[PDB]
C-alpha cells in the first residue's frame, strides 16, 4: 500500500488580513513538502532530503497552486461565514484533505477527498468520485454549487491520474528510504507498583511503516484485562514508537506474553522478558 | 470589431488575461504599453465566459485620498453593490477580482495574474 | 450593445475562430448535435498554445476526438488520425487542465463549440 495524502489548513485572523494557510504533502508516512505564508519563504519548500535536487520548473508550478489555493480559501472562509450567519470577529478553520491510494497490483486502488468547517466535516467527495455530498444540513448550498458546475470530474482526474502518477514519480526518487522497511527494536521493561502488583510494558522502537498492532496474551488464548496502550508516536528522524502495558500479579509474570504484528517483520515476534 | 492575436474578444472589447504573475503597479504600466487599461468592471456579466475561473485577477481600482473612497482607473465611482465589502478593504492594499464576483484586498507589492481591457474605435 | 459581426452574440473571438462557452451539462453525442444545430462544429484543438488559453476560459470540455472500439486509433471529425497525446470503455476525449483525457461518452460534461 502507498498513498500521496495532502493536508491543507486555513485559519482566519480578523486582526491581520490574510488568513494563515499551511500545506503538507505526505508520501506514505513522510512529510516531504510544506507550505506556509507566515515564513520568510511564501513558496513551497522541501523537507525530505530527496527533493533537494528538484529544480525551479517544479517548485514554481506547486507554489502556483498553494498561493492560489490560499486565495480561494480566503474567500470560502468569508463565504462560509455568511452561510452560518457568524460574527465577523470570530476565528474559524477550513481544512481540505485529499488522497489517492495504490494497492498490490501497484495501480490505483481507491481515492478520496473531503472538506471540513471547524472540526465538523463539511463536504465529501463520494466513493465513486463523480458527485459531491453535503455533510452538514447547511452544506447543501456548497454541494449544489459544485455538483452543477462539474468540479468532481476535475478531481476524478487528479485522483485517478495525477496523484497516482506522482506517487510513482516520488517513490522512484526516495526509493532507497521510503521503501526501506524498518523492523521495530523490541524489548520488555519491568516496573513494580506495590508488593502484590506490577506493570509489564512491551516496547516497540523505530519502525518506518507507521501502522502497527501490539498485543498482550496470556499463555495461549490471551486476555486483554487491565491492559493499556498509547498513541503511536513519531521518533523525530522519521521512524515510529509505541508501547503496550498491562497490570500483572507480582511474582509470576511469565504467565503473560507479548506479540508484535508489523508489516516489515517476517515473523510476528514473541516477547517474554 | 477585431482584436489582437493573444487577445480574447467579447462584446467588442479586447481582453488580455495573464499568463504570468506581476505587481499591481507593474501590470498597470504593462497594459498601458499594450495600449489598454487595467480591468475596469461594468458588472458581473462583463466576465461571464470566464465563470469557472479560479485564478485571481488585478483590476484597475485604487483608493486615493481625494475622495476617501475606491475609484477606478478613469476616476469614476465604485458601484457600491458590485463589491459587497467595499467598506472593508485596507486602503494601503489593492483589490484583485475573480469572475465568480469575489474580490480580495491585497498587498500591492504582491504578485498576481491580471487583466487588461480595450474597446471600440 | 454591439458585438462582433463575424460571430454570434454571446460568443467569444480568439484566433480568427469564434467559440461558444458551454455552462450546460450534456453528453458527447448531444454535445456534437447541439454544436451542429448552431451552424458550427464541436471544439477542436489546434495548437498546444490555444490549449493554455482554453483552460483559463472554461476548464472541462468535450473535444471532437473519438475512438470507435477500445482499440482503434483516435480520430477527429474529419476522420483524420489525431495528432496530440490523449490519455477501458472510454471512447470520447475531454480537455481538462492543459491535457487531453479519455472519458465515458455518457458522462454529462460541458461542451464548447468552434468556428472558422
Amino acid at each position: 500500500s502507498h498513498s500521496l495524502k495532502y493536508f491543507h489548513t486555513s485559519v482566519s485572523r480578523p486582526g491581520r488580513g490574510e488568513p494563515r494557510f499551511i500545506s503538507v504533502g505526505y508520501v506514505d508516512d513522510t512529510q516531504f513538502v510544506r507550505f506556509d505564508n507566515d515564513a520568510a519563504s511564501p513558496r513551497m519548500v522541501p523537507r525530505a532530503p530527496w527533493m533537494e535536487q528538484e529544480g525551479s520548473e517544479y517548485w514554481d508550478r506547486e507554489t502556483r497552486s498553494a498561493r492560489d489555493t490560499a486565495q480561494i480559501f480566503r474567500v470560502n472562509l468569508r463565504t462560509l461565514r455568511g452561510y452560518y450567519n457568524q460574527s465577523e470577529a470570530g476565528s474559524h478553520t477550513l481544512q481540505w484533505m485529499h488522497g489517492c491510494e495504490l494497492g498490490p497490483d501497484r495501480r490505483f486502488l481507491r481515492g478520496y477527498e473531503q472538506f471540513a468547517y471547524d472540526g465538523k466535516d463539511y463536504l465529501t467527495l463520494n466513493e465513486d468520485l463523480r458527485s459531491w455530498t453535503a455533510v452538514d444540513t447547511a452544506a447543501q448550498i456548497s454541494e449544489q454549487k459544485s455538483n452543477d458546475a462539474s468540479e468532481a470530474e476535475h478531481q476524478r482526474a487528479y485522483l485517478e491520474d495525477t496523484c497516482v502518477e506522482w506517487l510513482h514519480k516520488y517513490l522512484e526518487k526516495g526509493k532507497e528510504t521510503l521503501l526501506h522497511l524498518e523492523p521495530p527494536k523490541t524489548h520488555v521493561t519491568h516496573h513494580p507498583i506495590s508488593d502484590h502488583e506490577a506493570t509489564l510494558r512491551c516496547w516497540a522502537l523505530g519502525f518506518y511503516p507507521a501502522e502497527i498492532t501490539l498485543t498482550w496474551q496470556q499463555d495461549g488464548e490471551g486476555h486483554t484485562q487491565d491492559t493499556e496502550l498509547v498513541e503511536t508516536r513519531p521518533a523525530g528522524d522519521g521512524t515510529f514508537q509505541k508501547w503496550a502495558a498491562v497490570v500483572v500479579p507480582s511474582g509470576e509474570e511469565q504467565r503473560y506474553t507479548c506479540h508484535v504484528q508489523h508489516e516489515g517483520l517476517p515473523e510476528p515476534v514473541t516477547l517474554r522478558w | 470589431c477585431s482584436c489582437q492575436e493573444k487577445w480574447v474578444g467579447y462584446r467588442c472589447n479586447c481582453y488580455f488575461i495573464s499568463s504570468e504573475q506581476k505587481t499591481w503597479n507593474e501590470s498597470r504600466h504593462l497594459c498601458a504599453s499594450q495600449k489598454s487599461s487595467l480591468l475596469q468592471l461594468q458588472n458581473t456579466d462583463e466576465l461571464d465566459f470566464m465563470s469557472s475561473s479560479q485564478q485571481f485577477y488585478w483590476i484597475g481600482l485604487s483608493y486615493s485620498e481625494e475622495h476617501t473612497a475606491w475609484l477606478w482607473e478613469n476616476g469614476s465611482a465604485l458601484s457600491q453593490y458590485l463589491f459587497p465589502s467595499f467598506e472593508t478593504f485596507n486602503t494601503k492594499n489593492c483589490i484583485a477580482y475573480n469572475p465568480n464576483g469575489n474580490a480580495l484586498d491585497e498587498s500591492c507589492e504582491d504578485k498576481n495574474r491580471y487583466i487588461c481591457k480595450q474597446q471600440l474605435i | 450593445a454591439r458585438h462582433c459581426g463575424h460571430c454570434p452574440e454571446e460568443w467569444i473571438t480568439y484566433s480568427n475562430s469564434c467559440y461558444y462557452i458551454g455552462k450546460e451539462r450534456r453528453t458527447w453525442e448531444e454535445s456534437l448535435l447541439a454544436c451542429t444545430s448552431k451552424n458550427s462544429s464541436l471544439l477542436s484543438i489546434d495548437n498546444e498554445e490555444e490549449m493554455k488559453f482554453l483552460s483559463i476560459i472554461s476548464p472541462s470540455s468535450w473535444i471532437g476526438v473519438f475512438r470507435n472500439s477500445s482499440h482503434h486509433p483516435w480520430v477527429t471529425m474529419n476522420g483524420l488520425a489525431f495528432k496530440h497525446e490523449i490519455k477501458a470503455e472510454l471512447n470520447c476525449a475531454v480537455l481538462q487542465v492543459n491535457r487531453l483525457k479519455s472519458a465515458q461518452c455518457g458522462s454529462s460534461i460541458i461542451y464548447h463549440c468552434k468556428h472558422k
Binding site: 480561494i72 470560502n76 463565504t79 485529499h98 463539511y122 454549487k145 459544485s146 476535475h154 | 479560479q54 | -
Partner: peptide
C-alpha cells in the same frame, strides 16, 4: 504535486 483545483464553497 497537489490538486490543481479546489472548490468555491
Amino acid at each position: 504535486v497537489m490538486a490543481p483545483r479546489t472548490l468555491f464553497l
